[PDB]
């Protein structure tokens, strides 16, 4: 597989190797704020990251993943629309070449500069590989980034990117606190969807926070200096690694707030 984000291997091509690309519950989507309905029975959302153990950061030639030790319930997401316990395995971002694009979800067609995905798997399925095969296997917490003031809790990420410039590079990344990437409010929208990269599996309960976080232009500029290519290959800047909005089809987006 040689998928990517260019003209020749980008989102419009994915359906040929991954037919589920045209499925009934694909992500991302546009969130129409005037059609999403407040759901008074959503239970409170619970982000328990106090014991989180980050291990490593990896440039995978599409984005960078910050990886966590998920061998026990150290950093978990529960509540909201979720039944049971979901374990944090990694986070990554999607971003643009320009500040007016980059996010995957959109809000009344508004694109943010970037979008953070904290990826969690349902522990009743035992491992991540089994979880991606289930309709309720993953919960992804989505957070929009806008360009404004710097996010202090992000700077440790920005500063290690020099060391993982090219595809296949990784670096030790211990003692990173993902609580520093959260906005004040946990108000959210939720809907059933999919992974937004191949294999595009329809296994995600999406929880997208309404409140974006602000990051500085300098911070996002450093994302844009990463490379999709491997070391010693011709340089392709890692920008515009976002899949555009997919048909909502027979789904409802629910709001946690009035
Ligand atoms: C987590 C993810 C994709 C995404 O973030 O859309 C992913 C990527 C490859 C495999 Cl094999 C499984 C999951
Ligand atoms: Zn993502």
Report on the structure:
The protein is mainly beta and 258 residues long. It has a single domain, classed as Carbonic Anhydrase II (Roll), CATH 3.10.200. The protein has 3 helices and 15 strands. Strands 2, 3, 4, 5, 6, 7, 9, 10, 11, 12, 13, 14 and 15 form a 13-stranded mixed sheet that branches. A two-stranded parallel ribbon has the order 1-8. Strand 4 and strand 5 form a beta hairpin. The radius of gyration is 17 Å and the shape is globular. The site of zinc ion has 4 residues, from strand 7. It is found in: Cytoplasm; Cell membrane. Keywords: Acetylation, Cell membrane, Cytoplasm, Disease variant, Lyase, Membrane, Metal-binding, Osteopetrosis, Phosphoprotein, Zinc. Its EC number is 4.2.1.1, 4.2.1.69.
Query: For the CA atoms, what is the radius of gyration?
Result: 17 Å
Structural category is mainly beta
3D shape: globular
What is the CATH topology assignment?
Answer: Carbonic Anhydrase II
CATH level 4 superfamily: Alpha carbonic anhydrase
Oligomer: monomer
Number of contiguous helices: 3
CATH architecture: Roll
Q: Count the strands?
A: 15
GO biological process, one term: neuron cellular homeostasis
Subunit structure: Interacts with SLC4A4. Interaction with SLC4A7 regulates SLC4A7 transporter activity. Interacts with SLC26A6 isoform 4 (via C-terminus cytoplasmic domain).
Organism: Homo sapiens (Human)
GO cellular component, one term: apical part of cell
């Amino acid at each position: 597989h040689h998928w990517g984000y260019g003209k020749h291997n980008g989102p419009e091509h994915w359906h040929k190797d991954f037919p589920i690309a045209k499925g009934e519950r694909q992500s991302p989507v546009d969130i129409d704020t005037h059609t999403a309905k407040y759901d008074p029975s959503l239970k409170p959302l619970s982000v328990s990251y106090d014991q989180a153990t980050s291990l490593r950061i990896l440039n995978n030639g599409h984005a960078f993943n910050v990886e966590f030790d998920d061998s026990q319930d150290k950093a978990v997401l529960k509540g909201g629309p979720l039944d049971g316990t979901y374990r944090l395995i990694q986070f990554h971002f999607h971003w643009g070449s320009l500040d007016g694009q980059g996010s995957e979800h959109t809000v009344d067609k508004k694109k943010y500069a970037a979008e953070l995905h904290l990826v969690h798997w349902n522990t009743k399925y035992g491992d991540f590989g089994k979880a991606v095969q289930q309709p309720d296997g993953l919960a992804v917490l989505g957070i929009f980034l806008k360009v404004g003031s710097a996010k202090p809790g992000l700077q440790k990420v920005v500063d290690v990117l020099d060391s993982i410039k090219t595809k296949g590079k990784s670096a030790d990344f211990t003692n990173f606190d993902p609580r520093g990437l959260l906005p004040e409010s946990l108000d959210y929208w939720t809907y059933p969807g999919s992974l937004t990269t191949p294999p595009l599996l329809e296994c995600v309960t999406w929880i997208v926070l309404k409140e974006p976080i602000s990051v500085s232009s300098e911070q996002v500029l450093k994302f844009r200096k990463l490379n999709f290519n491997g070391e010693g290959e011709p340089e392709e800047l890692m920008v515009d690694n976002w899949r555009p909005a997919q048909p909502l089809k027979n789904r409802q987006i629910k709001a946690s707030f009035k």
